[PDB]
Symmetry: C4
Subunit: 369 residues, 4 copies
């Protein structure tokens, strides 16, 4: 309905009927142009890690609780003193303009509607200021792709601070792009503007070209960069892409106020483990000294419960939210979170867990299947 | 042949040719309306637990016994001093009217014909009194879905006592319904009356609406509820839905006279383990202090043998009996139990086990496949 | 080409081109009538054990030997002082008339041609005397299905002794038939005469009916029956169907001069382990005090090598030989043994094993796949 | 485009677009005659080992490294003081004339273009002198199939020394050919000349027939043969086909200056383990006393990284290079190495490994999938 550089964007704004989150992919495939769809759906190399992100949830099982003496489970929780209606949040994803003309503005509205946490992205088709304006008083985190150019870093961080963002997510697992075959097969050219890079170019970036700003992304990321971002913003800094206990501890020693356990939805180091399979050992080393956010493969209520029980404080979604955004805009995003909340409330009742803390204190079984 | 609220019910009354119990599903799918069929066949979320209920029987193997010195195995056993011709019994299932116009009356007749134990259900399309009348002197258990309304609980328990039921099964693993996609895809409305709720409404329920009685089902179930039902009936109370050793012991401490190991045929907490995979550890903690009933996934003689050898005293069937009920009414149900008895007698002879006690004392192998 | 009771039998007599033994099944399926084919190919219940008989060979691996200093491996071996050109032998199979009009006479000729050991069966379509006459001076074992009628047992054993048989195989794992669905689906009636039962009827059986003789098969088999057959024949008695170390030792204590590790090609106790998976523990308890024969699932050279390396002295084939018999009679059987010998000689060269003893002393790897 | 003995050879000379190395097989299948294609693609028996060569890379996982402080990974390495731009090399393969009229001359050019190590083969369609002339100053190893005729061995070794080859690869795992069904199904006759055997016949072989020279290949290979080749050439001798730690140590004790861990691409001892599954235990026994070369199943960047991290110094490719040779000659071979280098550089950046030594010192995870 909206065209940008030859690419068709959804303008839909409606509640959507959701059977489950996995089925949103084939539904969204009918309306997202083939190149954009492949960009969103695909992982790196032969997609082994992407597939294992789903299958790894079967490595642990939830015990049904008999005679639990609870009813009406509550999804409410908190991070950094911010109250949330649900522990399910939006993973930062820079390609939401591939799904919808409103991009992260509609995603921001959907998260605000369910009282969930929104993460806005460096490469968004819409500006930090626009996305925060769309969300109103709803809490937002800002995901930074750090540049070699500290003028770029400080300009985007100042824009995030002006937009009242509550934390910075430093993404460190994409210093180069994974080898994604879908984009090669589709001969796909990313067709969207990058509103934050355009704004920097027009402001403190003194007219520097967009391709030059893009190419300035840092491949060399050190612990001292974490402390520098923390000192500059006086916001909590969360390191995203952690897949080992040792890296969690190095991040906390470098000044991180949070650990985001992620393999980038299996789009980066193919042949790395399923994200779920390293969560518990990471959480054991962290020992609750900072909040943990988990993503990569979460689709069912049982998956969310298992991630919380294995040491996550919040659980993020990427692809299912992008598909819901294409299918129904702001109300489409709302529908995805409401659907997953419903599947989680059922599991919590059957597992005897009244609150999100009770889920976190739940002991999963470990039979081999 | 019979229509109720637009829904077609079987009136068949015939012996059926059974290749195996798994094949009854595709046979019954030709005659049960699509919505009713999906309601019966389906499990929760992605049906992982439902599938594992079948595959988990491969986690243990039966040793053939050479030079066993036995012939003509005997299927006879006992629970609470009640003699039975077979250790295979009917799992309580509230939806038998979806298969057949006689519902649990035909099931009661089939179980009486093989000298097996019948369990009648709270939500049956036919009354406690009718089902007990159909069974004649055959032993029956009554499955209770406990209400917040103790007038409802005491009325149904009094009706069960008047019908000479020998034990109460308290089902505790369905305080909310699992998320079952088949009913969403089929847009299925349960079309049957609930004869026990209608009777309560007309009697001690003083005209209270059916939907209001239904909605009064307790989500908060505590150990003290078990003792209260035991004190009120002076019958043995069996807790159904136990999937952990700790919950077995809590149930016995609360006054349970039996443990029913079940995950509700994978219809409830999807992402929970296969029922077979927790049976042996539950039976080790119970240490024969009360009888154990096992269900969820039982289809072959080898499955029944493995459940008895892993600590079950009785093994229940759900779906295969519902399918046989659709296909042949009372004689259809009889055919299902006779078929599974035949497969079990073959295994017992080849395994060198003369009696059901010998099966229970059998040591299964544990190679990994 | 030959008709018996409506059933078409092969009369083929030719060398056959063999890609591998597994492919003989689809080749033979083109020429064996559907009912006979299903009788041969099928296993019991859902054929899990039958399938695992094949897959279990992957549980161990053969190390290639570098710098082995050997060439021209030799397949020669010995049992009870009988010289054999190959450790691959014929498993006793009572249904060879379903494949070919000559039945075990052609099988006897094929085994004689490769210098292999033939086992003739109780229920053969052709007599003990005819099969031994067909084999000439080639060594034969006789497989007994023990009757309750010791007049029957002693008559067949006397006939076996007159035919110069070198050992008795007592089959003990088929006291009842496994539940085989193929025969139910095909509505298959065994159409062949049982030449040994007819001969008994005409001789010491004093005209007793064939069905009555057949029905006299013993379901109660005790250790004292083994010693009785040994005392009566003064031949070595091998117990067939052993799947546990304890049963191997009980058989040796009862007077057995050999152990035949078998699950009857997955036709009997479905839900029992793969035959290969219990071989090594049985061989560890036997500790070479008597020869071990292994069968059930052997198709490739690597399978034969792995069975010998895991404690077998001889490895038997059932189904592949029956299929080769249908396809080419005596030369068809010869072709099957020559093909498997060729695959084994290649493995022995690459594994650095000069003789069959070197294979038996080989240490298999145990990586998990 | 070129015909030899009825067989069509590629004459292509072009850069090729590569999605991944696995997809080269179906691309090359469109242009290689069916018999030649089956000869290249196939393994022995049922191809279990061939399949496991691929699946075994999933037995270990690469940890993404957060805050790694590196960029621009370097692929440079060294063997025997020879500088290489990449640790990926050409496995010796005697059938390159089945892909292309230039055979190993084009392969030699492709390896020279990426600064990689070429291995020329005994049975090549082109001579040792021609292949070395094609490669210019690029380093080459010569793979020997040892004869019983030491006049043959010394003539080819003298030709290799004259061609400035830097090491001898003694292949010891093909003393007989594996049973390869593709050649049986295709009725395939190897149609190419063997230029090295023809040259020997015309020179020191004094007119001896090609079939007679071919048939003189040694099946009996001893440790003293390794020392004899080392003494005669004064070159490092690498033993190829090692699959056990014990055989690695026996090879080093016999005078080997290198170990080449290989199962010949699953073409030899089917039922042997996946090559990757024995690499680490071999490397633990070798303890860096000599270089290790690894092959069999390598297709992705993650595979190369995992082999280096598990104790390989160099990683060889067979089939993918043969397919690239068919598709684009010298530039086709170049394209295959450039593609795999690109996938490896991405993994090294995401894993935090600056150099090939850093990859070798990387600790892989070992979760079970
Ligand atoms: C299309 C797409 C774009 C993404 N862009 C970003 C990004 O800009 N920054 C970032 O930190 N992660 C990005 N991610 C990774 C997500 O934050 C998240 O780790 C991933 O989507 C989680 O896996 P899931 O999609 O299976 O839920 C992206 C993921 C997708 C699929
Ligand atoms: C259609 C249907 C209705 C059911 N209704 C009840 C019920 O009313 N009460 C109860 O305790 N269990 C109920 N169950 C669960 C059964 O008691 C039993 O646990 C289950 O069917 C066992 O698994 P199986 O079907 O694989 O044998 C029901 C199961 C099915 C399939
Ligand atoms: C069609 C058929 C008939 C058989 N009849 C007999 C028999 O009469 N006596 C016996 O001891 N075993 C019998 N067996 C079992 C074989 O001796 C042997 O254990 C089996 O075929 C081995 O497995 P395989 O077919 O996979 O090689 C029979 C097997 C088949 C398939
Ligand atoms: C068609 C073909 C011909 C081969 N010829 C030889 C050879 O002449 N000498 C040798 O040492 N290895 C030979 N090999 C084995 C390779 O050196 C190497 O071990 C194998 O191709 C590695 O597995 P991959 O193909 O999966 O990469 C050959 C392999 C193939 C597929």
């Amino acid at each position: 309905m909206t065209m940008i550089n030859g690419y068709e964007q959804s303008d839909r704004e409606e509640k959507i009927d959701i059977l489950n989150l996995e089925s949103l992919e084939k539904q969204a495939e009918e309306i997202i142009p083939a190149g954009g769809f492949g960009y969103i759906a695909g992982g790196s190399e032969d997609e082994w890690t992407l597939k294992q992100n789903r299958m790894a949830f079967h490595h642990r099982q939830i015990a049904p609780k008999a005679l639990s003496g609870i009813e009406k489970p509550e999804l409410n929780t908190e991070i950094f003193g911010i109250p949330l209606n649900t522990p399910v949040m939006m993973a930062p994803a820079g390609a939401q303009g591939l799904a919808h003309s409103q991009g992260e503005k509609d995603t921001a509205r959907g998260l605000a509607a369910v009282g969930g946490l929104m993460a806005q992205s460096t490469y968004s088709s819409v500006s930090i200021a626009e996305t925060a304006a769309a969300g109103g008083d709803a809490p937002q985190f800002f995901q930074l792709y750090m540049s070699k150019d500290w003028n770029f870093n400080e300009s985007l961080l100042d824009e995030a601070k002006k937009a009242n963002v509550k934390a910075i997510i430093l993404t460190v697992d994409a210093t180069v792009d994974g080898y994604r075959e879908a984009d090669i097969k589709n001969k796909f050219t990313f067709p969207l503007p990058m509103a934050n890079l355009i704004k920097f170019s027009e402001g403190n970036g003194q007219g520097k070209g967009i391709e030059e700003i893009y190419a300035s992304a840092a491949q060399n990321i050190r612990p001292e960069d974490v402390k520098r971002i923390a000192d500059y913003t006086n916001l909590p800094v969360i390191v995203k892409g952690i897949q080992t206990p040792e890296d969690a501890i190095r991040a906390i020693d470098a000044g991180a106020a949070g650990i985001y356990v992620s393999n980038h939805g299996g789009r980066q180091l193919n042949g790395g483990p399923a994200s779920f399979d390293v969560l518990e050992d990471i959480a054991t080393a962290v020992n609750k000294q900072v909040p943990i956010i988990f993503d990569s493969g979460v689709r069912r209520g049982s998956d969310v419960f298992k991630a919380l029980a294995s040491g996550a404080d919040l659980v993020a979604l990427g692809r299912p939210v992008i598909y819901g955004l294409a299918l129904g805009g702001a109300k489409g995003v709302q529908s995805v979170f409401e659907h997953l909340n419903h599947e989680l409330e059922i599991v919590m009742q059957l597992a005897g867990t009244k609150t999100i803390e009770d889920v976190k204190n739940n002991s999963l079984l470990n039979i081999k299947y």
